[PDB]
Design a protein around this ligand. Structure first.
Ligand SMILES: Nc1ncnc2c1ncn2[C@@H]1O[C@H](COP(=O)(O)OP(=O)(O)OP(O)(O)=S)[C@@H](O)[C@H]1O
Ligand SMILES: Nc1ncnc2c1ncn2[C@@H]1O[C@H](COP(=O)(O)OP(=O)(O)OP(O)(O)=S)[C@@H](O)[C@H]1O
Ligand SMILES: [Mg+2]
Ligand SMILES: [Mg+2]
Lengths: 344, 150, 194
């Protein structure tokens, strides 16, 4: 009865603040991806999952749109700050066929045999871990052939012969395969939606795209239909709409405002025009990283120069303003809003 | 084609020796290794009847889990299996049917179970609206679609 | 209070003779590049940097105009004459795809596994080092694919599974890519200004 009460309390806690809202705190946009991953993890946590076959994701999309971020926050939801339950594996290190020894150790009679495997040790430490095979496409496909046993049934026999059950693990595979195709199709669908919207005012990735465009590209890159068949959910991360760009700029400015308030006690403020000016630095190919670098260039370098020159004392209200060049403005009263002379 | 032509009124050894034997010799690179094999067994893809059987097998698995764990009598029609067959991919095989059942049916079941829309003992029925929709059936013919909020 | 006073004294020392003047002693011209690199390093040293993501530069330009020189003097500013904090890696050695074993070391059961990686050892010796991937456009692009985890998050797992936190590092990538286009555009802009 106590275990059932604890399970009901955990279920009420998850229903109060599920993974969708916890991801929407960090991730911006990607509502299809958050919905897919949340429905899958809800199926897992509520006991409605086949315990034999582990849950396996493939996160596809352009660069810097929350693939690794959503994987990290998924791992933090499942295991909190426990580093054991988040087995990151940067698969760009695995560019050759012989790099499977990192997974499964080394055979008897060879160097590194006593240490055994790395992934098999980490999965022995936490069988139900969220293993993030980040940038899986950059590995050799023969290295991804080891993941067949680990995805169909959750087993990965090391060099010493010791198999480890990994059935409760949530494997996540970030990849930029068909990133250009997903980005172009999303932009085309948004253009068609805007066309239909303005036509009506004058008065979602389709399965065919997944099977006709993306499926041949994945079959070309991964070279094995069984590997793609083992994936439970090929998730599609789309590029950012303009509202999502304004939200990303507000997120980055809120991050720097929180750092300025916590560390230095500088109430950093800004206008909507500041976000509209910083959206122009968005590159479609680079994603959210372009907004972060634009905020670091335009805004944060001025803040660092003003702080080094002792122009930002503690407890000052510092408004960013568009003159388009952004310009800081320390505030003392309502009318008193002087610009800071940031010398070179 | 021959069936419809007559109505209008197995792997062959040649395919094994001509098509498959060079491919096996190319991959395995040793005729001795293939000559030690007693029986090269050929597994074929699924016919449409076998796809409906696979969907019924997966739905029966989830029905057994729903009855054993949570005591929920899950039910479905032939139209449900016909809709879920469309998620089949020839390249992935029976795993595609398992993933389609887990996507369409069981995510809705888990969302309804988390939201306490599925108490112990209830004739739940999957139904084609094509989107599948749950319908908790009370006593007699009274039914109602579950309002699975986000 | 002693740590705050030492930080204020170091900030006054940096404000006296900043990296811009220290580069102008050794570098001639390249005022935009000195300004960009100095602004980014000023953002780093004053604590106005995202600690999760390391700082990464890509020095583009023609030959013999101070890319490697500005990278070297940047490393000298950050770490003085300490050789640990200047992890040079000439990327003309990295032409083939299989040259990533120099970065990450050999896997288990292979020659050089006990020695581990080279860059991962050098970053274990100095996590906040100025790594200079010199001549980055001569390596294979597949070899530069290893730098994704090392640039977005500052992590690189060696052959022995030991990850090293490189988040405080300053990666610099000298490159001659688009050298002719940059030179022609600069000469065109200067002729138009004349
Ligand atoms: N949708 C988003 N909302 C908020 N922050 C984001 C979003 N997308 C990316 N970021 C930020 O971007 C940085 C890293 O982004 P990633 O998580 O690498 O995305 P990604 O799509 O893996 O692409 P890659 O480059 O091809 S591996 C982190 O600091 C995140 O905070
Ligand atoms: N702007 C400069 N001011 C002073 N010395 C310079 C300058 N630019 C280059 N040098 C000298 O040039 C020599 C090496 O030049 P680098 O620093 O290699 O320049 P670079 O642009 O890397 O181009 P490369 O050949 O294509 S790798 C050193 O001895 C530096 O002293
Ligand atoms: Mg990533
Ligand atoms: Mg050079």
């Amino acid at each position: 009865k106590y275990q059932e009460k604890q399970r009901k309390r955990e279920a009420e806690e998850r229903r109060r603040f599920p993974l969708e809202q916890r991801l929407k705190e960090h991730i911006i946009g990607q509502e299809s991806a958050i919905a897919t991953v949340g429905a899958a993890i809800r199926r897992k946590e509520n006991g409605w999952y086949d315990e034999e076959h582990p849950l396996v994701f493939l996160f596809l999309g352009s660069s810097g749109i929350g693939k690794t971020e959503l994987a990290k926050q998924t791992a933090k939801y499942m295991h909190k700050d426990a580093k054991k339950g988040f087995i990151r594996l940067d698969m760009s290190e695995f560019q050759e066929r012989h790099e499977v020894a990192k997974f499964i150790g080394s055979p008897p009679g060879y160097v590194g045999h006593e240490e055994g495997g790395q992934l098999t040790k980490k999965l022995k430490q936490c069988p139900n871990a969220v293993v993030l095979f980040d940038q899986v496409d950059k590995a050799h496909p023969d290295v991804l052939t080891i993941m067949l046993q680990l995805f169909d049934e959750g087993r990965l026999t090391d060099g010493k012969g010791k198999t480890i059950d990994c059935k409760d693990a949530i494997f996540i595979m970030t990849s930029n395969v068909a990133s250009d195709e997903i980005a172009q199709h999303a932009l085309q669908l948004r253009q068609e939606a805007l066309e239909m919207s303005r036509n009506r005012i004058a008065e979602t990735i389709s399965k065919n795209f997944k099977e006709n465009v993306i499926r041949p590209i994945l079959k070309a890159h991964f070279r094995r239909d069984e590997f793609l068949g083992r994936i439970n959910e090929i998730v599609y991360f789309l590029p950012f709409c303009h509202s999502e760009l304004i939200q990303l700029v507000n997120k980055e400015l809120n991050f720097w405002a929180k750092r300025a308030k916590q560390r230095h006690n500088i109430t950093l403020l800004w206008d909507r025009e500041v976000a509209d000016v910083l959206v122009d630095g968005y590159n479609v190919h680079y994603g959210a990283r372009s907004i972060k670098h634009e905020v670091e260039r335009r805004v944060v370098n001025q803040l660092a120069a003003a702080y080094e020159q002792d122009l930002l004392p503690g407890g000052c209200t510092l408004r960013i303003t568009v003159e388009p060049k952004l310009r800081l403005e320390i505030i003392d009263k309502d009318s008193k809003t002087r610009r800071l002379d940031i010398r070179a």
